[PDB]
């Protein structure tokens, strides 16, 4: 019963180019950099 | 003798241990079953925590070494030294009882 | 004076006898090897350089086989 | 089926088809077989696909039931 | 191979020194099929039977052995261990092979377990599918192609190529010895090279085989591993060639035409009750009763008919120094190839197979240290006496039948 | 090295070529444009600091001030600059002008040294070439294509002119420096062993040696006109002259201008006149000793698994005719899979030369692919296989000579060995069999010594 789920899993993992269109990995980088804490002791 | 337990015991290469023909090294005051060409030691013990040892007679074709510990753990050591085994299967037995 | 002009060829001691077998087999001239200095130095007739180029087809094949 | 793996090869080349010689060849051997079950012989069922059954009726069922 | 309940006939690749007959018994339990083991020789009978003892209860319930003179329960069980189809002689084996073929097609038709099919021709495969009506076939062979053939593929009758494992992950885990390949090219002796291009018979094969320049290197490789008391065995295709290699330096030797009772004790003198270290084997004492399983292998001849038999011998003999290697190397593997003897025709094809096994390959034409070593054949007088013996050896010296 | 060691370092080739020139030509060489080149090309600080010492001092100084300026822990580096002092050939040791062994520099070079550092005048801003006040007002990327075409034509002569039909005399020019070899059975020249390395680093340092190749004849060519003309492209871009060079020129200045334009360091307008503009490759000549560039992604990547070395493919029109010139590889059906059965193709090119260091340089340094992505050493175990193929051509030797046999004593043969060794006609000797090989070039001299002893 391994090939019954392994064949359908590769169909989703192969189409990984669709995730690059969304700005998920880019919008977080600009927001995580502006996090400047200020605790002057 | 210098009354110091000198002369390092005879070292025998390639010794089986439950389908694992590793390497049992006999140093000075402790035993060390070195896992093949490595730097660490899998079976690490000394010349103290070994109760009694067992060997094989002349009638048995196989030659296995058994070291009875203290908590009931018995580990067999099937010898496989292709060089000299008849003369060394007793040397391992003799050098572990004549030198303490 | 007594001189002997030839073509100096530097080779391997175990390979010197390879050219000697061709001397007793080739029937083109009188004798292939004219003078043998040592195990790493042999001579050959100067006018047989172009003829020796034909034997490269059978010499280079076994050369890569070493 | 071979028609599904062809679309993935065309996307890898990035605007370019793989020549076209091997495209028409993707129609030979299919996935067919036999299964032994309660019938005590053979039960003819293979995979959930559909091109593996269409090209077979013109050989075995035409000469014997 | 079987991960969806379907069939998918093919040949899988697995390490030789890890358990070739062990994956077949484990797969037979998940497939839930009354399989049939078909070995390649007599050594495959005791190997497959050992896995049905410490893993299942088939050894004392549904066991059967049609070969090696047993016939244990001919009716009442289908799981048996045979040897392909070598039990079908004309006239001499009439009613013996008839009862085996008829009673097999009725109570057995499961999986056709096959092992080592890269040396079996297509003529034997025709008799396998004829005597049995198996509905599936299994392929357990670690090699890629068969009999070194690239123009004719005869693997479509016993299952083609299915999947191969990552040899880089298999070697860097604890499944095969860290084989360090290094070719050693020795110069050709001038006294024996003159008679090689002189005759046109099969006697010239022993000339470059008995190379004194290679014998000094063969003895140096043994001495190089004698101080390291490692399991070393020199391989040779010829039978009467490895005999002189052991008498000159006082070492035991075994070959084909010997005795069954003599090899029974000598074979145990290397793995069970050892006493001799340097032993010389061939193509008979390896796949007949017990696997050699040494560590260092030396190849003398590289032009024999067994151009693919030594491929699987590299994995079965060269075993690790423990069984679960971490990440360092220790095992060595050299090869003695003559120079200017038309031997590179096979020494080149081995490079295509070693790069796929993840082994380190290199060429060392100069040992650098062979002359400064207490070896034999130091003077030129001893090398001349060997010529009067090699040419005087009759080529009829082979077995004793007519 | 077979003729490229003097190209990597510029300050060493200039000192070696200066030693073999005419005394009248060296006088005109000591000019103001040459002062900024004998120091900028150097590298050690000791050889460059002595230039400023001979400028302020008006009287010759003895060697006592030099042996004391090293204080006590610096005389070790003084011996390294001793050999360089005679390379430039500008100093002069007198007898005793004020002490003992007074060192002084040529006052002809000292006058022009202050013009290009402190003092000045008028003739420096009147002559062209060295100055030429003119700005640039032309499309720069449009002229960069002509710089590559000048170097591509040279590649056609190294192969055998596959599609070129120009009348440029560049085949015989490169044959003098040991780069191109004339074909014996044919007529189109090929390439030597040192010519393969030139097509690997791709540095403009070799073009500097091509400019001074015509001056090596020492007949009717001067160095003062070549040095003042080579300074044009050394100032990067924005260094022209509009039409000032047309009014002030001669027949000798036009000859060196046409040869420099065909090298790839300067571009000339139509009709070989009007305005000239240097190429882009001249910037790297004054920057360092080498350089890189020409790619932005590096699609090529070799294989470090097997041993046939799968070379890179699919790049541009430069690597197409470059690999075939090396050893003529093979190609299969797809995008020109080069180098797939390398076993006999490499041995065909090694029979005409010991080209062993150029193949390794092309295999390791081709576009920097593995040394940036991976980590271990690029060549696997082929470093020994390449040396084996070079030794295969050493199994034989095609040379002529005469042999002397049948002597009488043993002590008499040892005296004859020194006769052929001093003259340079001895090849191999044998004291055990009394045999000596003598080249036919000195056969008429060895026979005379034997008849007298």
Over chain D, what HEC string results? CHHHHHHHHHHHCCCCCCCCCCCCCCCCCCCCCCECCCCCCCECCCCCCCHHHHCCCCCCCCCCC
Q: Is E10:E163 a contact under the CB 8 Å cutoff?
A: yes
Whose CA is closest to E82, among E92, E67, E62? E67
Contact at CB, E342 and C65, closer than 8 angstroms: yes
DSSP, res E338: E
Q: How far apart are CA E65 and CA E83, in angstroms?
A: 10
For chain F, give the secondary structure using H, E and C: CCCCHHHHCHHHHHHHHHCCCCHHHHHHHCCHHHHCCCCCCCCCHHHHHHHHHHHHCCCCEECHHHHHHCCCCCHHHHCCCHHHHHHHCCEEECCCCCCCCEEEECHHHHHHHHHCCCCCCCHHHCCCCCCCCCCCCCCHHHHHHHHHHHHHHHHHHHHCCCCCCCCCCCHHHHHCCCCCCCCCCCCCCCCCCCHHHHHHHCCCHHHHHHHCCHHHHCCCCCHHHHHHHHCCHHHCCCCCCCCHHHHCCCHHHHHHHHHHHCCCCEEECHHHCCCEEECCCCHHHHHCCCCCCCCCCCCCCCCCCCCCCCCCCCCCCCCHHHHHHHCCCCCCCCCCCCCCCCCCHHHHHHCCCCCCHHHHHHHHCCCCCHHHHCCCCCCCCHHHHHHHHHHHHHCCCCEEEEEECCCCCCHHHHHHHHHHHHHCCEEEEECCCCEEEECHHHHHHHHHHHHHC
Q: How far apart are CA E66 and CA E70, in angstroms?
A: 6
For C4-29, give the secondary structure using H, E and C: EEEEEEECCHHHHHHHHHHHCCCCCC
Q: Is F205:F290 a contact under the CB 8 Å cutoff?
A: yes
Q: List, in sequence order, every residue forming a beta bridge with B33; answer none if it has no partner.
A: B43
Q: Is C33:F429 a contact under the CB 8 Å cutoff?
A: no
Inter-axis angle of helices F357-364 and F382-391, to 10 degrees? Answer: 160
DSSP SS3 for E299: strand
CATH pick for C3-64 out of 3.30.70.1220, 3.90.870.10, 3.40.30.10, 3.20.20.370: 3.30.70.1220
Give the β-pairing of B64-68 and B74-79.
antiparallel
Q: How far apart are CA F83 and CA F397, in angstroms?
A: 39
Experiment type: cryo-EM
Contact at CB, F404 and C3, closer than 8 angstroms: yes
Q: How far apart are CA C63 and CA F343, in angstroms?
A: 13
The resolution, in Å, is 7.2
Q: How many CA atoms lie within 13 A of F82 on its CB side?
A: 9
H or E element at residue E260: helix E260-268
Contact at CB, E6 and D34, closer than 8 angstroms: no
Of all residues in chain C, what percent are helix, strand and coil, respectively (each to 5)?
A: 45, 20, 40
Token pair 């050893």 is found at F327
Detail the DSSP E strand segments found in E136-262: 136-140, 161-163, 181-186, 232-235
Q: Is B53:B85 a contact under the CB 8 Å cutoff?
A: no
Return residues 53-82 of B near E (CB < 8 Å).
Answer: 61-63, 79-82
Using CA coordinates, name the residue in chain E closest to B88: E275
User: Which residues does chain D have within 8 Å of residue E34's beta carbon, measured at their own beta carbons?
Assistant: none
Contact at CB, E325 and B21, closer than 8 angstroms: no
How many residues belong to chain D?
65
Structure token digits, residue F211: 């400019």
Using CA coordinates, name the residue in chain E closest to B86: E275
User: Which residues does chain A have within 8 Å of residue E5's beta carbon, measured at their own beta carbons?
Assistant: 1
Q: Is F19:F210 a contact under the CB 8 Å cutoff?
A: no
Rounded to 10 degrees, the C-alpha dihedral B60/B62/B65/B66 comes to: -70
How far off is chain A from E1, nearest CA to CA, in Å? 10
The torsion angles phi and psi of E13, rounded to 5 degrees, stand at: -110, 130
Return residues 11-50 of C near E (CB < 8 Å).
Answer: 12-18, 21
Token pair 């053939």 is found at E149
Return the number of other C-beta atoms located less than 10 Å from residue C11's C-beta. Answer: 17
Using CA coordinates, name the residue in chain B closest to E226: B83
Q: How many CA atoms lie within 13 A of F109 on its CB side?
A: 20
Contact at CB, F384 and E362, closer than 8 angstroms: yes
Tell me, yes or no, whether chains F and E touch by having 3 or more C-beta pairs under 8 A. Answer: yes
User: Which residues does chain C have within 8 Å of residue E194's beta carbon, measured at their own beta carbons?
Assistant: 17, 21
Q: How far apart are CA F30 and CA F110, in angstroms?
A: 9
Residue E354 in contact with partner chain D when CB distance is under 8 A? no
DSSP, res E354: H
Q: How far out from the chain centre does Cα F350 lie?
A: 23
Q: Is F396:C11 a contact under the CB 8 Å cutoff?
A: yes
Q: How far apart are CA B68 and CA B71, in angstroms?
A: 9
User: Which residues does chain F have within 8 Å of residue E361's beta carbon, measured at their own beta carbons?
Assistant: 307, 381
Whose CA is closest to F169, among F157, F181, F159, F177? F157
Q: Residue F22: exposed, middle, or buried by beta-carbon count in 10 A (0-12, 13-18, 19+)?
A: exposed
Q: Is E51:E9 a contact under the CB 8 Å cutoff?
A: no
For A1-41, give the secondary structure using H, E and C: CCHHHHHHHHHHHHCHHHCCCCCHHHHHHHHHHCCCCCCCC
Q: How far apart are CA E69 and CA F264, in angstroms?
A: 88
Return the number of other C-beta atoms located less than 10 Å from residue F326's C-beta. Answer: 20
Residue E110, annotated as binding a ligand: no
Q: How far apart are CA E396 and CA E202, in angstroms?
A: 11
- CA dihedral sign of residues F19, F25, F31, F34: negative
Q: After which residues is chain F broken (C to N over 2.5 A)?
A: none
Q: B interface mutation test: which of E320, E322, E326, E332 has the most B CBs within 10 A?
A: E322
The torsion angles phi and psi of F69, rounded to 5 degrees, stand at: -70, -15
| C-alpha triplet E64, E67, E73: angle, nearest 5° | 25
Of residues F307, F384, F388, nearest to E351 (C-beta): F307
Contact at CB, C14 and E345, closer than 8 angstroms: no
Q: Residue F145: exposed, middle, or buried by beta-carbon count in 10 A (0-12, 13-18, 19+)?
A: exposed
Q: How far apart are CA F24 and CA F21, in angstroms?
A: 9
User: Which residues does chain C have within 8 Å of residue F400's beta carbon, measured at their own beta carbons?
Assistant: 5-8, 46
Tell me, yes or no, whether chains A and C touch by having 3 or more C-beta pairs under 8 A. Answer: no
Q: How far out from the chain centre does Cα E149 lie?
A: 19
Q: Is F197:F358 a contact under the CB 8 Å cutoff?
A: yes
Tell me, yes or no, whether chains C and D touch by having 3 or more C-beta pairs under 8 A. Answer: no
How far off is chain E from A14, nearest CA to CA, in Å? 21
| C-alpha triplet F439, F445, F450: angle, nearest 5° | 105
User: Please, which chains are in contact with D (at least 3 CB pairs closer than 8 A)?
Assistant: E
User: Which residues does chain F have within 8 Å of residue C49's beta carbon, measured at their own beta carbons?
Assistant: 398
Q: How far apart are CA F198 and CA F196, in angstroms?
A: 5
């Amino acid at each position: 019963r391994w090939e019954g789920g392994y064949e359908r899993t590769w169909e989703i993992l192969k189409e990984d180019e669709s995730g690059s269109l969304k700005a998920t990995i880019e919008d977080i980088l600009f927001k995580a950099k502006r996090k400047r804490v200020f605790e002057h002791h | 003798m210098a009354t110091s337990s000198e002369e390092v015991l005879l070292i025998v290469k390639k010794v089986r241990q439950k389908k694992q023909d590793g390497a049992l090294y006999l140093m000075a005051e402790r035993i060390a079953w070195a896992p093949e060409g490595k730097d660490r030691f899998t079976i690490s013990h000394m010349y103290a925590d070994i109760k009694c040892q067992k060997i094989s007679p002349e009638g048995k074709a196989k030659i296995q070494l058994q070291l009875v510990l203290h908590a009931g753990d018995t580990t067999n050591f099937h010898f496989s030294n292709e060089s000299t085994a008849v003369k060394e299967r007793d040397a391992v037995k003799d050098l572990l009882q004549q030198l303490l | 004076v007594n001189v002997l002009k030839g073509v100096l060829i530097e080779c391997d001691p175990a390979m010197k006898q390879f050219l000697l077998y061709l001397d007793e087999s080739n029937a083109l001239g009188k004798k292939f090897i004219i003078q043998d200095i040592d195990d790493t130095h042999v001579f050959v007739i100067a006018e047989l350089v172009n003829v020796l180029q034909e034997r490269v087809g059978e010499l280079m094949d076994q050369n890569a086989f070493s | 089926q071979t028609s599904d793996i062809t679309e993935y090869l065309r996307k890898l080349s990035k605007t370019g088809v793989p020549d076209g010689i091997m495209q028409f060849i993707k129609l030979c051997t299919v996935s067919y077989g036999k299964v032994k079950l309660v019938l005590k012989h053979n039960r003819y069922f293979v995979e959930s696909c559909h091109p593996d059954v269409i090209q077979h009726l013109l050989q075995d069922p035409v000469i014997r039931e | 191979m079987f991960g969806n309940g379907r069939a998918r006939s093919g040949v899988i690749v697995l390490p030789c020194g890890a358990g070739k007959s062990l994956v077949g018994v484990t797969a037979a339990c998940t497939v839930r099929k009354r399989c049939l083991v078909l070995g390649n020789s007599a050594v495959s009978v005791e190997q497959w039977k050992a896995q049905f003892k410490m893993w299942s209860t088939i050894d004392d319930s549904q066991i059967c052995r049609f070969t090696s003179d047993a016939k244990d329960k001919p009716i009442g069980c289908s799981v048996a261990i045979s040897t392909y189809s070598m039990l079908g002689h004309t006239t001499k084996r009439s009613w013996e092979a008839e009862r085996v073929m008829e009673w097999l097609k009725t109570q057995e038709w499961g999986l056709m377990i096959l092992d080592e099919v890269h040396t079996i021709p297509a003529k034997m495969f025709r008799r396998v599918l004829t005597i049995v009506q198996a509905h599936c076939k299994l392929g357990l062979t670690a090699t890629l192609v068969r009999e070194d053939d690239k123009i004719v593929d005869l693997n479509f009758l016993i299952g083609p190529k299915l999947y191969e494992a990552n040899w880089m992950e298999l070697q860097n885990n604890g499944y095969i010895a860290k084989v360090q390949c290094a070719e050693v090219w020795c110069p050709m002796s001038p006294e024996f090279y003159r008679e090689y291009v002189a005759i046109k018979t099969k006697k010239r094969i022993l000339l470059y085989t008995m190379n004194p320049n290679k014998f000094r290197a063969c003895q140096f490789l043994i001495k190089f591993h004698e101080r390291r008391n490692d399991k070393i065995i020199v391989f040779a295709d010829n039978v009467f060639a490895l005999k002189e290699y052991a008498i000159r330096l006082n070492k035991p030797y075994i070959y084909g035409p010997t005795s069954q009772g003599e090899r029974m004790q000598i074979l145990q003198n290397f793995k069970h009750n050892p006493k001799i270290n340097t032993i010389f084997i061939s193509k008979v004492g390896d796949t007949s009763f017990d696997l050699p399983e040494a560590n260092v292998l030396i190849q003398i001849s590289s032009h024999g008919g067994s151009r693919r038999q030594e491929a699987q011998r590299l994995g079965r003999v060269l075993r690790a120094k423990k069984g679960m290697v971490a990440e360092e190397y220790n095992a060595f593997f050299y090869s003695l190839v003559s120079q200017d003897t038309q031997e590179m025709a096979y020494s080149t094809k081995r490079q295509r197979f070693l790069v796929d096994q993840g082994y380190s390959f290199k060429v060392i034409t100069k040992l650098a240290g062979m002359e400064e070593e207490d070896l034999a054949f130091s003077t030129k007088e001893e090398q001349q006496q060997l010529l009067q013996k090699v040419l005087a050896a009759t080529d009829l010296d082979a077995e004793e039948e007519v | 090295s077979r003729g490229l060691n003097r190209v990597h370092l510029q300050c060493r080739n200039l000192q070696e070529f200066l030693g073999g020139l005419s005394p009248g030509v060296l006088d005109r060489l000591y000019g103001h444009p040459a002062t900024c080149l004998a120091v900028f090309r150097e590298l050690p600080s000791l050889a460059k600091n002595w230039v400023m010492r001979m400028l302020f001092l008006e009287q010759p100084l003895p060697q006592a001030a030099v042996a004391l300026w090293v204080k006590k822990e610096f005389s070790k580096a003084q011996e390294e600059s001793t050999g360089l002092l005679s390379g430039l050939r500008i100093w002069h040791t007198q007898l005793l002008p004020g002490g003992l062994q007074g060192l002084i520099l040529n006052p002809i070079f000292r006058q022009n040294l202050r013009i290009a550092l402190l003092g000045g005048g008028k003739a420096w801003s009147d002559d062209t070439s060295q100055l030429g006040p003119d700005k640039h007002a032309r499309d720069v990327p449009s002229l960069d294509k002509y710089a590559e075409e000048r170097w591509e034509v040279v590649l056609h002569f190294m192969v055998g002119s596959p599609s070129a039909a120009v009348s440029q005399d560049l085949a015989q020019l490169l044959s003098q420096a040991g780069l191109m070899k004339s074909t014996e059975p044919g007529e189109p020249p090929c390439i030597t062993s040192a010519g393969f390395q030139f097509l690997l680093l791709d540095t403009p340092a070799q073009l500097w040696y091509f400019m001074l190749q015509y001056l090596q004849t020492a007949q009717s060519r001067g160095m003062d006109l070549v040095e003042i003309l080579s300074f044009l492209f050394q100032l990067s871009f924005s260094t022209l002259g509009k039409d000032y060079s047309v009014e002030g020129m001669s027949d000798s200045l036009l000859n060196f201008l046409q040869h420099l334009r065909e090298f790839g360091l300067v571009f000339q307008r139509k009709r070989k006149s009007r305005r000239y503009y240097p190429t882009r490759l001249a910037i790297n000549l004054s920057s360092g000793v080498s350089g890189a560039g020409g790619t932005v992604h590096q699609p090529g990547f070799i294989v470090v698994e097997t041993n046939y070395r799968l070379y890179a493919y699919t790049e541009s029109e430069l690597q197409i005719a470059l690999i075939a010139l090396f050893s003529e590889m093979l190609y299969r059906f797809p995008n020109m899979v080069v180098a797939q059965v390398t076993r006999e193709s490499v041995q065909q090119a090694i029979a005409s030369g010991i080209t062993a260091q150029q193949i390794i340089h092309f295999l390791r340094t081709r576009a920097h692919p593995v040394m940036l992505k991976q980590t271990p050493v690029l060549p696997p175990t082929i470093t020994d296989q390449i040396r084996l193929w070079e030794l295969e051509r050493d199994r034989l030797r095609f040379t002529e000579g005469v042999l002397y046999n049948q002597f009488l004593s043993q002590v008499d043969f040892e005296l004859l060995l020194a006769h052929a060794r001093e003259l340079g006609v001895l090849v191999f000797e044998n004291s055990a069999k009394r045999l000596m090989v003598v080249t036919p070039a000195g056969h008429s001299d060895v026979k005379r010594f034997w008849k007298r002893q």
